Amino acid sequence: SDAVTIRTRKVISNPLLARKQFVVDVLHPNRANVSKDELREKLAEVYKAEKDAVSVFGFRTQFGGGKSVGFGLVYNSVAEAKKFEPTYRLVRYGLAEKVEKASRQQRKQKKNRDKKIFGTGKRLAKKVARRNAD
Template sequence: MSDAITIRTRKVITNPLLNRRQFVIDVIHPNRANVSKDELRDQLSALYKVEKDSVSVFGFRTAFGGGKSTGFGLVYNSVADAKKFEPAYRLVRYGLAQKVEKASRQQRKQKKNRGKKVFGTERKAQKKAAKRNAD
């Protein structure tokens, strides 16, 4: 990992509605298979003089033959802006949010449909039990 890499940003746009700068990143990495997103976030935070947590990178594609990758980058004005506008899954990747554990989609649908078949007072009891289990 001691091999030098070069980062170039192009198509830089300032997006005041989302409090960020967005751009395409070209990474030149000869003699390396690829560069980690964490390492890119470190270098971009130094380049734009912001905290590492306010930088987001994604969508990288390595060119055929290697040596060059292209992706997308966002630099938010603050970490609070990043938490406000970034998708939850990316915040989880960067350690800024906790992943919400829930049953699989199929299990949730099956539970919903089983509940449809219960009537009257039994249904009220079932809902109370579900609330107690959720708490």
């Protein structure tokens, strides 16, 4: 964290999503690349808002090293951040726990099977078992 000098440009404050967007550029000479968590925590301790109310994404590195530019978001409160922010970005920040589902192919196969099945199907399955048994 030596001369990282994270700084902000084109600051727009929108209450429509109760936040402010900006382009955040980090000049980090003699540094490979500063991570998203470090960028967000420094942005938080710079804007005096909160650690988990700030968001960073993008951050393309200039050719040859030296600088990285990305888009930054800081929110009025962590609640509104959890409301407005996308699920994938929340899961990346760790604020949210990702849902666990199967593959899309499996989900579509399941949907096709249960669209073949009409109604609840419990009575049909019981009848099929009874007829197969005797």
